[model samples]
Target: LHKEPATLIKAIDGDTVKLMYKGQPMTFRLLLVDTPEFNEKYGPEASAFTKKMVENAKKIEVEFDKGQRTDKYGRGLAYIYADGKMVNEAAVRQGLAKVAYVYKGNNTHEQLLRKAEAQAKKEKLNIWS
Candidate 1:
């Protein structure tokens, strides 16, 4: 099983979130989404989108994937939820990010995310625009 439910503390960027997990501050990198740098064009826009979602969510949950728990910086690589909606997938669907870092035979939402990316790109939404 994965970790317990968490609260969104802040959104560091489009694909990075700061949350309260297990009574301590933790950084969660949204599992399958990759956005631009915060300083890059449209980066702040993506960050705003993430922050908006968290602010509107009643509960933010966290669940780990089948691979590594964290990177060298100790940030947990996790898929997060905002009010039952998968934030990682939402980012892609909204064109704030792209399907990225997909591990083979690991991600549960791999196909869904890839589909979302294609649709977003085809529609030229936000970042894809």
Candidate 2:
């Protein structure tokens, strides 16, 4: 875990970014949160909100656990600790993303994210809206 908040400049798509964390390039995608597409309903909002939440903060902490951490792109699977909270859960809770499971079985926070998505859907949050 490091201490440096990077501004989330732009979300290239549903699974990419353009930003700088501290002094390093921070353009890694989430491990399993397949958000909406840039043109898929609330896609832009999701990306925009994510960017707003991360841009130009004081510091951020990176953490992870279990299963496949990253992919062929070498993007490290991590739990973004920003604004004193886990970014993954925050996104789901806000209806900005859904549970994206890339592998089989319980690898990451699949069940929890699924539940969050279900709740978001029921509440007509984000895309559901």
Candidate 3:
């Protein structure tokens, strides 16, 4: 997989973001992760965490999975990186998100993400609690 540089325009909740990629603004849904919506439980905290991570990052990038490029809504499906750290995994590790929407043979960080989710679950963090 190749990573492409992008500039964060906004963090639209925990698993969605808007960015400037290759001179065009685009929206991306973080691959294999799901966070609560604004009206849902823990939604505000998840959104704040995501905003903090991206806003504090010095560099941001995106990576695509082999199986899909966009969801039904036309939002780019990708893995988001902040300073080389996988934000999807971070969210799971923190119990702010969960592994979801997995496609067979398309997972890039499935093992790592699942591990983090398990750890968060065991620790009873946020959603897991």
Candidate 4:
């Protein structure tokens, strides 16, 4: 896996984060996950959860997918890791995010993410509940 070290600036929402990567500040849209907007129900909780994880982590990194690196909005699309834990999967496992926006050749972690989302749904956690 090609991963780049990053420093967390903050989590914009559950699935979007701002970080310092390669000496430049970048906004990263978490790949294969979608969280509620701030105005939606449980949005604050999801955002808080993401922020807590990244803020408390000993390390942070970003891994790009095989597909496009950025979205139409110009946000970097990648997987975020905090202390070796994949934040994208973590959010879904906690029921804070839903597996989404999957595309061809960019689903490197699709299976793991889907598994987590299924478990969360079965448990009726957060959004799933």
Candidate order (lDDT): 4, 3, 1, 2
> Among these predicted structures, which one has the highest TM-score?
4
Distance from true location, Cα of 116 in model 3, Å:
0.4
> What local lDDT does model 3 show for residue 96?
97
RMSD of each: 1.6, 3.5, 0.9, 0.8
Higher-lDDT candidate among 1 and 2?
1
lDDT, candidate 4, residue 14?
93
Off by over 4 Å in 2: 1-15, 18-26, 102-106
TM-score of 3: 0.96
Candidate 2 residue pairs that clash:
5-59, 7-56, 8-55
| Tens-digit lDDT track of model 3 for 74-122 | 8988999999999999999999999998888669889989999999999
Pairs with backbone N, CA or C atoms under 3 Å apart (clashes), candidate 3: none
What is candidate 1's TM-score against the reference?
A: 0.91
Q: Could you tell me how far off, in angstroms, the CA of residue 48 lies in candidate 4 after the best superposition?
A: 0.5
TM-score against truth, every candidate: 0.91, 0.72, 0.96, 0.97
Candidate 4 lDDT trough over 10 residues, lowest sum: 1-10
In model 2, what is the error at residue 25, expressed in angstroms? 2.5
Q: What C-alpha root-mean-square deviation, in Å, does candidate 1 show against the real structure?
A: 1.6
> What's the lDDT of the predicted structure labeled candidate 4?
0.94
